[PDB]
Design a protein around this motif. Structure first.
Motif, PDB file in Angstrom:
ATOM      1  N   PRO A  46       5.731   0.322  -4.894  1.00  0.00           N
ATOM      2  CA  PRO A  46       5.137  -0.119  -3.386  1.00  0.00           C
ATOM      3  C   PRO A  46       6.180  -0.651  -2.682  1.00  0.00           C
ATOM      4  O   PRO A  46       6.987  -1.448  -2.980  1.00  0.00           O
ATOM      5  CB  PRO A  46       4.139  -1.247  -4.030  1.00  0.00           C
ATOM      6  N   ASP A  47       6.231  -0.497  -1.269  1.00  0.00           N
ATOM      7  CA  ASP A  47       6.814  -1.102  -0.074  1.00  0.00           C
ATOM      8  C   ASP A  47       5.996  -2.149   0.374  1.00  0.00           C
ATOM      9  O   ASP A  47       4.655  -2.336   0.332  1.00  0.00           O
ATOM     10  CB  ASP A  47       7.001  -0.110   0.937  1.00  0.00           C
ATOM     11  N   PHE A  48       6.701  -3.108   0.929  1.00  0.00           N
ATOM     12  CA  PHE A  48       5.970  -4.507   1.069  1.00  0.00           C
ATOM     13  C   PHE A  48       5.963  -4.865   2.665  1.00  0.00           C
ATOM     14  O   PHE A  48       5.482  -5.975   3.028  1.00  0.00           O
ATOM     15  CB  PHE A  48       6.810  -5.697   0.173  1.00  0.00           C
ATOM     16  N   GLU A  97       0.803  -1.287  -0.124  1.00  0.00           N
ATOM     17  CA  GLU A  97      -0.042   0.054  -0.112  1.00  0.00           C
ATOM     18  C   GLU A  97       0.783   1.333  -0.029  1.00  0.00           C
ATOM     19  O   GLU A  97       0.656   2.278  -0.717  1.00  0.00           O
ATOM     20  CB  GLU A  97      -1.056  -0.042   1.333  1.00  0.00           C
ATOM     21  N   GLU A  98       1.924   1.383   0.831  1.00  0.00           N
ATOM     22  CA  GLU A  98       2.925   2.608   0.805  1.00  0.00           C
ATOM     23  C   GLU A  98       3.689   2.608  -0.513  1.00  0.00           C
ATOM     24  O   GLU A  98       4.284   1.587  -0.992  1.00  0.00           O
ATOM     25  CB  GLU A  98       3.692   2.505   2.248  1.00  0.00           C
ATOM     26  N   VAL A  99       3.842   4.025  -0.994  1.00  0.00           N
ATOM     27  CA  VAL A  99       4.662   4.338  -2.201  1.00  0.00           C
ATOM     28  C   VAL A  99       5.785   4.915  -1.594  1.00  0.00           C
ATOM     29  O   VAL A  99       5.715   5.926  -0.686  1.00  0.00           O
ATOM     30  CB  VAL A  99       3.760   5.104  -3.125  1.00  0.00           C
ATOM     31  N   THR A 100       6.927   4.419  -2.015  1.00  0.00           N
ATOM     32  CA  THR A 100       8.257   5.282  -1.629  1.00  0.00           C
ATOM     33  C   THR A 100       8.891   5.328  -3.155  1.00  0.00           C
ATOM     34  O   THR A 100       9.318   4.089  -3.833  1.00  0.00           O
ATOM     35  CB  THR A 100       9.369   4.305  -0.899  1.00  0.00           C
ATOM     36  N   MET A 150       4.459  14.870   3.886  1.00  0.00           N
ATOM     37  CA  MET A 150       5.012  13.412   3.458  1.00  0.00           C
ATOM     38  C   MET A 150       4.248  12.299   3.588  1.00  0.00           C
ATOM     39  O   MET A 150       3.896  11.426   2.744  1.00  0.00           O
ATOM     40  CB  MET A 150       6.085  13.112   4.617  1.00  0.00           C
ATOM     41  N   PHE A 151       3.242  12.313   4.429  1.00  0.00           N
ATOM     42  CA  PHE A 151       1.969  11.274   4.564  1.00  0.00           C
ATOM     43  C   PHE A 151       1.094  11.255   3.575  1.00  0.00           C
ATOM     44  O   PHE A 151       0.662  10.148   3.027  1.00  0.00           O
ATOM     45  CB  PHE A 151       1.445  11.250   6.148  1.00  0.00           C
ATOM     46  N   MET A 152       1.032  12.199   2.818  1.00  0.00           N
ATOM     47  CA  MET A 152       0.075  12.421   1.870  1.00  0.00           C
ATOM     48  C   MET A 152       0.950  11.743   0.624  1.00  0.00           C
ATOM     49  O   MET A 152       0.285  11.025  -0.150  1.00  0.00           O
ATOM     50  CB  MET A 152      -0.399  13.788   1.107  1.00  0.00           C
ATOM     51  N   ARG A 153       2.045  12.067   0.540  1.00  0.00           N
ATOM     52  CA  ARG A 153       2.848  11.391  -0.629  1.00  0.00           C
ATOM     53  C   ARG A 153       3.073   9.909  -0.384  1.00  0.00           C
ATOM     54  O   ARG A 153       3.176   9.016  -1.356  1.00  0.00           O
ATOM     55  CB  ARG A 153       4.286  12.092  -0.888  1.00  0.00           C
ATOM     56  N   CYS A 154       3.185   9.366   0.531  1.00  0.00           N
ATOM     57  CA  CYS A 154       3.145   7.904   1.250  1.00  0.00           C
ATOM     58  C   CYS A 154       2.038   7.142   0.610  1.00  0.00           C
ATOM     59  O   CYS A 154       2.005   6.185   0.362  1.00  0.00           O
ATOM     60  CB  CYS A 154       3.388   7.724   2.666  1.00  0.00           C
ATOM     61  N   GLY A 211      12.023  -4.290   0.397  1.00  0.00           N
ATOM     62  CA  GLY A 211      11.217  -4.134   1.512  1.00  0.00           C
ATOM     63  C   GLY A 211      10.662  -2.710   1.597  1.00  0.00           C
ATOM     64  O   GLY A 211       9.456  -2.631   1.343  1.00  0.00           O
ATOM     65  N   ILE A 212      11.612  -1.671   1.786  1.00  0.00           N
ATOM     66  CA  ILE A 212      11.183  -0.406   1.636  1.00  0.00           C
ATOM     67  C   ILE A 212      12.434   0.211   0.850  1.00  0.00           C
ATOM     68  O   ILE A 212      13.556  -0.044   1.409  1.00  0.00           O
ATOM     69  CB  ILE A 212      11.001   0.467   3.224  1.00  0.00           C
ATOM     70  N   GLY A 213      12.039   1.081  -0.062  1.00  0.00           N
ATOM     71  CA  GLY A 213      13.018   1.874  -0.649  1.00  0.00           C
ATOM     72  C   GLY A 213      13.825   2.841   0.074  1.00  0.00           C
ATOM     73  O   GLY A 213      13.609   3.143   1.188  1.00  0.00           O
ATOM     74  N   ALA A 214      14.967   3.129  -0.550  1.00  0.00           N
ATOM     75  CA  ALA A 214      15.840   4.259   0.326  1.00  0.00           C
ATOM     76  C   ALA A 214      15.101   5.318   0.665  1.00  0.00           C
ATOM     77  O   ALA A 214      14.374   6.095  -0.210  1.00  0.00           O
ATOM     78  CB  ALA A 214      17.260   4.560  -0.496  1.00  0.00           C
ATOM     79  N   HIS A 215      15.271   6.048   1.829  1.00  0.00           N
ATOM     80  CA  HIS A 215      14.454   7.123   2.101  1.00  0.00           C
ATOM     81  C   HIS A 215      15.260   7.739   3.352  1.00  0.00           C
ATOM     82  O   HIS A 215      16.039   7.024   4.002  1.00  0.00           O
ATOM     83  CB  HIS A 215      13.037   6.927   2.425  1.00  0.00           C
ATOM     84  N   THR A 216      14.637   8.839   3.711  1.00  0.00           N
ATOM     85  CA  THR A 216      15.092   9.567   5.041  1.00  0.00           C
ATOM     86  C   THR A 216      13.852   9.924   5.808  1.00  0.00           C
ATOM     87  O   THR A 216      12.842  10.034   5.319  1.00  0.00           O
ATOM     88  CB  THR A 216      15.708  10.804   5.057  1.00  0.00           C
ATOM     89  N   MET A 247       5.110   6.342  15.803  1.00  0.00           N
ATOM     90  CA  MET A 247       5.584   4.961  15.701  1.00  0.00           C
ATOM     91  C   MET A 247       5.229   4.205  14.383  1.00  0.00           C
ATOM     92  O   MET A 247       3.861   4.092  14.346  1.00  0.00           O
ATOM     93  CB  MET A 247       5.680   4.119  16.876  1.00  0.00           C
ATOM     94  N   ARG A 248       6.063   3.367  13.622  1.00  0.00           N
ATOM     95  CA  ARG A 248       5.554   2.615  12.683  1.00  0.00           C
ATOM     96  C   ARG A 248       5.996   0.904  13.139  1.00  0.00           C
ATOM     97  O   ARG A 248       7.101   0.869  13.588  1.00  0.00           O
ATOM     98  CB  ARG A 248       6.210   2.774  11.336  1.00  0.00           C
ATOM     99  N   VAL A 249       4.939   0.250  13.319  1.00  0.00           N
ATOM    100  CA  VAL A 249       5.138  -0.969  13.779  1.00  0.00           C
ATOM    101  C   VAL A 249       5.167  -2.019  12.443  1.00  0.00           C
ATOM    102  O   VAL A 249       3.690  -2.060  12.001  1.00  0.00           O
ATOM    103  CB  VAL A 249       3.992  -1.414  14.869  1.00  0.00           C
ATOM    104  N   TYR A 263      10.377   4.434  15.556  1.00  0.00           N
ATOM    105  CA  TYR A 263       9.870   5.453  16.717  1.00  0.00           C
ATOM    106  C   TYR A 263      10.444   6.899  16.112  1.00  0.00           C
ATOM    107  O   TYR A 263      11.516   7.033  16.050  1.00  0.00           O
ATOM    108  CB  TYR A 263      10.049   5.202  18.001  1.00  0.00           C
ATOM    109  N   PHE A 264       9.533   7.920  16.203  1.00  0.00           N
ATOM    110  CA  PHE A 264      10.117   9.191  15.461  1.00  0.00           C
ATOM    111  C   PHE A 264       9.591  10.031  16.600  1.00  0.00           C
ATOM    112  O   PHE A 264       8.646  10.253  16.986  1.00  0.00           O
ATOM    113  CB  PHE A 264       9.361   9.483  14.214  1.00  0.00           C
ATOM    114  N   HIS A 265      10.638  10.821  16.966  1.00  0.00           N
ATOM    115  CA  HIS A 265      10.717  11.920  18.072  1.00  0.00           C
ATOM    116  C   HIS A 265      10.652  13.101  17.181  1.00  0.00           C
ATOM    117  O   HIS A 265      11.831  13.367  16.788  1.00  0.00           O
ATOM    118  CB  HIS A 265      11.814  11.683  18.878  1.00  0.00           C
TER     119      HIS A 265
HETATM  120  N1  LIG Z   1       5.893   7.257   6.817  1.00  0.00           N
HETATM  121  C1  LIG Z   1       7.386   7.039   6.601  1.00  0.00           C
HETATM  122  N2  LIG Z   1       8.260   7.451   7.601  1.00  0.00           N
HETATM  123  N3  LIG Z   1       7.504   6.190   5.728  1.00  0.00           N
HETATM  124  C2  LIG Z   1       8.934   5.808   5.477  1.00  0.00           C
HETATM  125  C3  LIG Z   1       9.251   5.292   3.908  1.00  0.00           C
HETATM  126  C4  LIG Z   1       9.488   6.577   2.796  1.00  0.00           C
HETATM  127  C5  LIG Z   1       8.220   7.021   2.574  1.00  0.00           C
HETATM  128  N4  LIG Z   1       7.324   6.465   1.773  1.00  0.00           N
HETATM  129  C6  LIG Z   1       8.599   8.363   1.651  1.00  0.00           C
HETATM  130  O1  LIG Z   1       8.069   8.299   0.503  1.00  0.00           O
HETATM  131  O2  LIG Z   1       9.101   9.249   2.318  1.00  0.00           O
END
Ligand SMILES: NC(=[NH2+])NCCC[C@H](N)C(=O)O
Ligand SMILES: O=C(O)CCC(=O)C(=O)O
Ligand SMILES: [Mn+2]
Length: 341
Positions: free
Chosen positions: A89-91, A82-85, A312-316, A184-189, A169-171, A281-283
């Motif tokens: 798609p990320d798995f 479902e998520e896009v990076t 960011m979450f809209m793009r994810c 699994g998940i593409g390169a990102h920050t 947090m992402r579980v 976890y994201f502080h």
């Molecule tokens: N919500 C997140 N922190 N996602 C991490 C993966 C990268 C995210 N899909 C992006 O395009 O930036």
């Protein structure tokens, strides 16, 4: 490689030992892009209970998991694929925990983007995740005070931004590799001040250390996304699973505020031969906080943290009900209003 591992003091006061530790944390990020912090018995217990709750949740039927979704907050379930990076798609399947705000909260009543209640699968899962995030937050505050001290800044420089911070947090559960695709998940920050993470024994996380002379995209700018960048270029460091530690690396806000003295660590995940559980976890700053350059007082640039999170979450999740409702109600315009009124 062999990462550095530090034990943090329970309280950070600004004594010489604290300043020295802050210098060492900065140096480890500047060399390796990451370090480990040792967990005590309660930090470890709470980590393991969270992982156990995650494993039990993921065994539930997809229809149930997919019901744990909100059109007000991004908290809740993300299906595998479902998520896009970077357009792909990320798995992992994911349960995202953002600030848990009922419809009685004034920000939710006002329609602030991303504000709403976590669609918890049950109350035991809620308690396990909240207890874990309380400990993660205490560590985050320690780390931010130490980081300020290491840069010779007032001890509260970063913690002043994290009062009622947008911690989340992402579980995660990664499936075993079952096709030709290992991604699994593409390169990102990631997007905030710090990323504190835990993983099981399986392995799959890779991080990119600082590289001399390598330009790093400023992922808070729409024309400089870090998603996908360097994915197939060395160097990548495997983060070896190690009992009794969490990992820590900087997010986008620390890169911005430090003018690149710290870099938001690029990272990616490869699928393994077995399923893999992890929690990230994201502080974060307060949703309303504006990050600013620490070492250039005349610089006018700022990052409104909540705006960055929302973008960011809209793009994810371009097609998620949460994103659809942001667009339908023009909640990004609300965000402009909340900045001033
Ligand atoms: N919500 C997140 N922190 N996602 C991490 C993966 C990268 C995210 N899909 C992006 O395009 O930036
Ligand atoms: O799987 C991991 O260890 C970390 C995953 C990650 O980077 C994330 O969820 O943002
Ligand atoms: Mn990440």
């Amino acid at each position: 490689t062999n990462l550095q591992t530090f034990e943090l003091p329970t309280e950070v006061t600004g004594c010489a030992a604290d300043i020295s530790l802050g210098r060492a944390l900065i140096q480890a990020w500047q060399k390796d892009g990451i370090f480990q912090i040792k967990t005590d018995s309660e930090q470890d217990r709470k980590t393991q209970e969270a992982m156990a709750a995650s494993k039990q949740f993921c065994k539930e039927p997809l229809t149930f998991k997919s019901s744990c979704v909100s059109d007000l907050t991004y908290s809740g379930y993300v299906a595998s694929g479902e998520e896009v990076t970077a357009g792909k798609p990320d798995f992992p399947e994911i349960f995202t925990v953002c600030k848990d705000l009922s419809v009685g909260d004034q920000r939710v009543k006002a329609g602030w983007p991303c504000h709403g209640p976590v669609p918890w699968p049950n109350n035991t899962y809620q308690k396990s995740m909240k207890t874990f995030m309380e400990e993660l937050g205490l560590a985050g505050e320690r780390l931010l005070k130490l980081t300020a001290l290491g840069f010779e800044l007032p001890i509260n420089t970063f913690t002043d931004l994290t009062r009622d911070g947008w911690h989340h947090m992402r579980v995660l559960r990664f499936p075993p590799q079952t096709s030709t695709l290992s991604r699994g998940i593409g390169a990102h920050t990631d997007y905030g001040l710090l990323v504190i993470a835990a993983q099981d024994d399986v392995g799959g996380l890779y991080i990119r250390p600082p590289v001399e002379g390598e330009k790093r995209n400023r992922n808070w700018l729409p024309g400089e996304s870090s998603a996908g960048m360097f994915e197939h270029d060395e160097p990548w460091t495997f983060v070896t699973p190690t009992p009794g530690v969490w990992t820590v690396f900087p997010g986008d806000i620390l890169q911005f505020m430090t003018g690149g003295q710290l870099l938001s660590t690029p990272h990616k995940v490869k699928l393994n031969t077995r399923e893999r559980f992890a929690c990230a976890y994201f502080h974060e700053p307060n949703f309303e906080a504006s990050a600013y350059p620490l070492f250039e007082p005349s610089a006018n640039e700022r990052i409104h943290y909540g705006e960055h999170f929302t973008n960011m979450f809209m793009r994810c999740y371009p097609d998620r009900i949460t994103t659809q409702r942001i667009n339908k109600e023009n909640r990004l315009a609300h965000l402009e209003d909340l900045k001033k009124y």
